[PDB]
Curated annotation (Swiss-Prot), chain A:
Recorded domain comment: The zinc-hook, which separates the large intramolecular coiled coil regions, contains 2 Cys residues that coordinate one molecule of zinc with the help of the 2 Cys residues of the zinc-hook of another RAD50 molecule, thereby forming a V-shaped homodimer. The two heads of the homodimer, which constitute the ATP-binding domain, interact with the MRE11 homodimer.
Record's protein name: DNA repair protein RAD50
Compartments, record wording: Nucleus; Chromosome
Boundaries of the shown chain within the full protein: 1122 to 1169 of 1315
Family as reported in the entry's similarity comment: Belongs to the SMC family. RAD50 subfamily.
Curated annotation (Swiss-Prot), chain B:
Full protein: residues contained: 314 to 411 of 730
Species of provenance: Chaetomium thermophilum (strain DSM 1495 / CBS 144.50 / IMI 039719)
Subcellular localization, as worded in the UniProt entry: Nucleus; Chromosome, Telomere; Chromosome
Protein name: Double-strand break repair protein MRE11
Protein purpose: Core component of the MRN complex, which plays a central role in double-strand break (DSB) repair, DNA recombination, maintenance of telomere integrity and meiosis. The MRN complex is involved in the repair of DNA double-strand breaks (DSBs) via homologous recombination (HR), an error-free mechanism which primarily occurs during S and G2 phases. The complex (1) mediates the end resection of damaged DNA, which generates proper single-stranded DNA, a key initial steps in HR, and is (2) required for the recruitment of other repair factors and efficient activation of ATM and ATR upon DNA damage.
Family named by the database record: Belongs to the MRE11/RAD32 family.
Domain of life: Eukaryota
Subunit structure: Component of the MRN complex composed of two heterodimers RAD50 and MRE11 associated with a single NBS1.
Length: 48, 98
């Protein structure tokens, strides 16, 4: 049972790690588009 | 043509500055002459002092492929002309075509 729960740690930790990375891509997908469309001074290409 | 892309196949930071000096400097050459042409009359009786002309250079550093032109800090580039241009904050604006 201890082995099972110890690798349950790895499952949930791996699962939780999967959610964190992908969101940075999603959010970052949306952020880059609005900044490019809105800014016109042009001294900054984009932000992440 | 003046550059002939000697930066495209090589490092650029060191000599890029060297390249623009000849371009920015000659702009100031005609900057004062046209002022001088209009101020030939009256023999500079009034406002004899020569005001610092305004210069703006619009450079696009779009690279064809596998090329990385080096771009210097705007402010640091601009202030290098302190005493020759009024707008020391910005003399060139660098942008890449989208």
């Amino acid at each position: 049972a201890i082995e099972d729960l110890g690798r349950g740690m790895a499952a949930v930790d791996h699962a939780i790690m999967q959610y964190h990375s992908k969101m940075m891509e999603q959010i970052n997908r949306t952020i880059a588009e609005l900044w490019q469309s809105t800014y016109q001074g042009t001294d900054i290409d984009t932000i992440q | 043509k003046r550059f002939k892309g000697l930066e495209k196949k090589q490092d650029n930071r060191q000599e890029v500055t060297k390249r623009l000096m000849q371009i920015v400097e000659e702009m100031i050459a005609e900057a004062n002459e046209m002022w001088r042409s209009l101020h030939e009359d009256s023999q500079d009786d009034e406002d004899e002092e020569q005001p610092l002309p305004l210069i703006r250079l619009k450079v696009e550093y779009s690279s064809p492929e596998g090329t990385k032109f080096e771009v210097e800090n705007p402010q640091r580039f601009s202030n290098r002309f302190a005493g020759k241009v009024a707008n020391q904050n910005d003399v060139v604006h660098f942008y890449r075509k989208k």
